[PDB]
Design a binder for these strands. Structure first.
Lengths: 65, 65, 218, 49, 100, 88, 129
RNA sequence: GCUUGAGUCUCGUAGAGGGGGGUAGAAUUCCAGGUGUAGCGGUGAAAUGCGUAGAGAUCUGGAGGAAUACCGGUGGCGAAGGCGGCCCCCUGGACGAAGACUGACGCUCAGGUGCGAAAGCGUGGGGAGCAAACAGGAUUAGAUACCCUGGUAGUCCACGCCGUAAACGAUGUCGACUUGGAGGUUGUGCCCUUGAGGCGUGGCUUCCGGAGCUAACGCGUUAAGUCGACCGCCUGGGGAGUA
């Protein structure tokens, strides 16, 4: 939200901004709500997130080349 | 892995904020359940603590206006 | 002493025990395998392994496992028996009616590197004739001199050489396979569970079988 | 204080803590050929110059 | 009969004329059959975010066992008091004594 | 909601013991006492359509154990509805 | 609710094979005892026990032979919805003589062959082969 | 007459389940006041429109109407449909540890009754954002389509009517039986819960597979597998799910 750092910068540095939320408000307020997307993307999204872990366990078995 | 909502028995009230200023980000946000490893149930129970802290002005909605 | 120190194996819980029956899987941290049914089930094992040995059954030793692959060459080459210690070629016991022609390939190239085309050609091509020899030899060598098909089959892993088991069943050959509680126990002559992925397992397994060969050839 | 030249930091325990179980008591890493073994054997493990 | 963790904040203006009301409110619980678990007066602790006008309100805790029909009249009084700006209660069965 | 303070008393009156609650004159009066106190719920606010299947449940089950007391003891059946009053 | 007790029995017998066990329990009755005692008399099932004081726990001991199930193809005839009343002449002979049919006769539950010995019938319980 | 079926009681558990009302924070449109520019919106490009009668933007204050962020989890509730802030009043369904009982009191079902998102209409309120009808600039051989600037029914709430759907893991409901694992969510019993563990017992749901079935893809303890009970429906498409 607000970064200060007295005078050892000489740069804008939007570090804590992007560390707090920053864009997380814009992504939801720019276009129409669309009553459907939540359902959709909450599900699809996390399902694929679980696949990476599943990938971790299934990629180390053989691979003998 | 914390002795908060596993060994810390019986709902953690928001009165002792000397621990809740560790759960909120220095602004007013909440730290995901995938960051500070706690069971989703009590992250909602801590969500009840932070919610009433926002209703009794101990933990605001955000840092400043 | 309790076979290779402890032949009831080990198998970590993802041991998915359909096999549950065949082992009454006792556990030790990681878990384990088949206490009872493995210890007693090996005396009667060397019994069948003894009879079809005297009636000349040609006992093949199959182990595609990189580590105990030489224990396969031990129990097989030290006697006269045959083996398969490398990459299981798809069809060396089901398309063998064409791999016998591959033996014609293997056995005559041995001849060509000897007195045939050993230096009657450009050096540039010579190199390749020899090279290929090594590759098809390390896996086909233990079947090259057979005068038919095997009857006794000592398959080590089932978790990896399941097709080695399946293609032998293309002719119905009895399989003496040491397996697991998450392997392929269905379709054997004798599943002798417990550990089947330990260097000393194959040490006293094949040692206790190499001795049985030294008797069945009389 | 090397794993390959002398021996396992701890008993059958890798320094990176990759290998743990007893069944892999001889496995050699394609990179670091370090056989996990009893630290007592790390009295017999001599090195050279 | 019922547990209600009544936490309330009054004005730093009433920071001195409220302890007298502390006598009022809990004496009313005495006149309505009820025991108090933790009577506390911390002071005028600094608020989180300014509540419409001023920052830093005067917090006072009670956490009292009283009928719901009594705390109903009570929260009404809080909400209809120029001191209290915010005052909320929790649910029954559980009670505290630490609050620190 | 059928308070516990009343349930243990109905089983205390109608039932011949503190805990012999698996009998006819108990489960009926108990469920009847649920309705008798449920007045306050289906009188005010009215639009509880999901709570309607809850009603469906308990009222019909009540008519099921009465459905059995009828085939057994008609003397106690007319007596049960006579003491408490659960026919009307 | 598990509308047919014999179904609850033969299902546990069919899939008792689909599980390949050696002992299967189920609610017992004078009837099931009868059927299993005849299944024993032949060589379908092995020794059954009525172990149970007032609660008869019908415990069977499945029987195999060569390494194959003797009770291989089995199900019910007298469905609770369709009760098939058969006489003596129009009696069903499973497998032209390689399987039998348990029948509750005017004398009781026994093989259809023993029902012929009596010369009377009616309720043909189930086909067991 | 007796219980392994159904169900009730004693003691408890989590939530977008619902109905009626209220509250909190902040914001788009609009209005006014302090400052100030000649541009703003938007598109592949362009433009109608607005503006020097000081817009857009910025700060503070205010009246309406409507919607619930991070936490969020092929997770939860339910017959289905559908539904996310919180509190207050009331209540139900699902499930479980250890026991006491009635003793098959159970399941389903044409005509029928009830629930029925959304939308249209009759009535009393209603209008910020958006949007059928319509107008205008254009890509184009044309625009009553994709874009944009406005705007009415409507969107919201309550009382009724039509009683309609992809009202679809497209798989009706109930009970029993048939090798498992990684998981997610919600309880409990036992052991040194000394610690975020181990071994059993139920509901819901996803994926990989065995027995089995199928045209095949694949379903697979929530089955398209094996039986019994109950109900609706089909006999090539079009005509037409229409008069």
């Amino acid at each position: 939200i607000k970064v200060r750092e007295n005078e050892p910068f000489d740069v804008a540095l939007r570090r804590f901004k992007r560390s707090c939320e920053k864009a997380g408000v814009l992504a939801e307020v720019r276009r129409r709500e669309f009553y459907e997307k939540p359902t959709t993307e909450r599900k699809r999204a996390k399902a694929s997130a679980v696949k990476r872990h599943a990938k971790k366990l299934a990629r180390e078995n053989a691979r003998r080349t | 892995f914390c002795r908060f909502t596993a060994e810390g028995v019986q709902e953690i009230d928001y009165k002792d904020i000397a621990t809740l200023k560790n759960y909120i980000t220095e602004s007013g946000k909440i730290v995901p359940s995938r960051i500070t490893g706690t069971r989703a149930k009590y992250q909602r129970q801590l969500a009840r603590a932070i919610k009433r802290a926002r209703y009794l002005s101990l933990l605001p909605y955000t840092d400043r206006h | 002493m309790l076979k290779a120190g402890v032949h009831f194996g080990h198998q970590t819980r993802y041991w998915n025990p359909k096999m549950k029956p065949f082992i009454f899987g006792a556990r030790n941290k990681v878990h384990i395998i088949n206490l009872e049914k493995t210890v007693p089930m090996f005396n009667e094992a060397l019994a069948e392994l003894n009879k079809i040995a005297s009636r000349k059954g040609k006992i093949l030793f199959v182990g595609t496992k990189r580590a105990a692959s030489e224990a396969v060459k031990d129990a097989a080459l030290s006697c006269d028996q045959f083996f398969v210690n490398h990459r299981w070629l798809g069809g060396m016991l089901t398309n063998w009616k064409t791999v016998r022609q591959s033996i014609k390939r293997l056995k005559d190239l041995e001849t060509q590197s000897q007195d045939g085309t050993f230096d009657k050609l450009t050096k540039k091509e010579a190199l390749m004739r020899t090279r290929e020899l090594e590759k098809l030899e390390n896996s086909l060598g233990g079947i090259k001199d057979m005068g038919g098909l095997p009857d006794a089959l000592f398959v080590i892993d089932a978790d990896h050489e399941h097709i080695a088991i399946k293609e032998a069943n293309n002719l119905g050959i009895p399989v003496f396979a040491i397996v697991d509680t998450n392997s392929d126990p269905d379709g054997v002559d004798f599943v002798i569970p417990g550990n089947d992925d330990a260097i000393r397992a194959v040490t006293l397994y094949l040692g206790a079988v190499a001795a049985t060969v030294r008797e069945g050839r009389s | 204080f090397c794993a390959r030249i002398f021996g396992p930091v701890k008993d059958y325990e890798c320094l990176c803590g990759k290998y743990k179980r007893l069944k892999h008591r001889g496995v050699i890493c394609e990179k670091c050929g370090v056989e996990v073994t009893q630290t007592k054997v790390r009295r017999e493990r001599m090195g050279h110059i | 009969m019922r547990h209600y963790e009544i936490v309330f904040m009054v004005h730093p203006d009433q920071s001195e004329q409220v302890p007298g009301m502390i006598e009022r409110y809990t004496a009313a619980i005495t006149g309505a059959e009820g025991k108090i678990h933790r009577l506390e007066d911390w002071g005028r602790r600094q608020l989180a975010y300014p509540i419409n006008k001023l920052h830093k309100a005067h917090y006072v805790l009670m956490n009292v066992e009283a009928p719901q029909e009594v705390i109903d009249e009570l929260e009404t009084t809080f909400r209809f008091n120029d001191a209290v700006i915010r005052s909320m209660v929790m649910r029954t069965k559980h009670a505290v004594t630490e609050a620190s | 909601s059928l308070s516990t303070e009343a349930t243990a008393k109905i089983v205390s009156e109608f039932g011949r013991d503190a805990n012999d609650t698996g009998s006819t004159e108990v489960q009926v009066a108990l469920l009847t006492a649920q309705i008798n106190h449920l007045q306050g719920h289906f009188a005010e606010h009215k639009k509880d359509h999901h709570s309607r299947r809850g009603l469906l449940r308990m009222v019909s089950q009540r008519r099921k154990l009465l459905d059995y007391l009828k085939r057994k003891d008609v003397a106690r059946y007319t007596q049960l509805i006579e003491r408490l009053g659960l026919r009307r | 609710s598990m509308q047919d007790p014999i179904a609850d029995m033969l299902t546990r017998i069919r899939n008792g094979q689909a599980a390949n066990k050696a002992a299967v329990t189920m609610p017992s009755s004078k009837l099931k005892v009868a059927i299993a005692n005849v299944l024993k008399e032949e060589g379908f099932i092995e020794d059954f026990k009525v172990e149970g004081d007032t609660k008869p726990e019908l415990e069977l001991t499945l029987k195999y032979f060569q390494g194959k199930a003797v009770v291989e193809s089995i199900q019910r005839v007298s469905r609770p919805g369709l009760r098939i009343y058969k006489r003596k002449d129009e009696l069903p002979k499973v497998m032209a003589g390689l399987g039998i049919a348990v029948v509750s006769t005017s004398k009781g539950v026994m093989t259809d062959r023993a029902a012929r010995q009596a010369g009377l019938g009616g309720e043909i319980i189930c086909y067991v082969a």
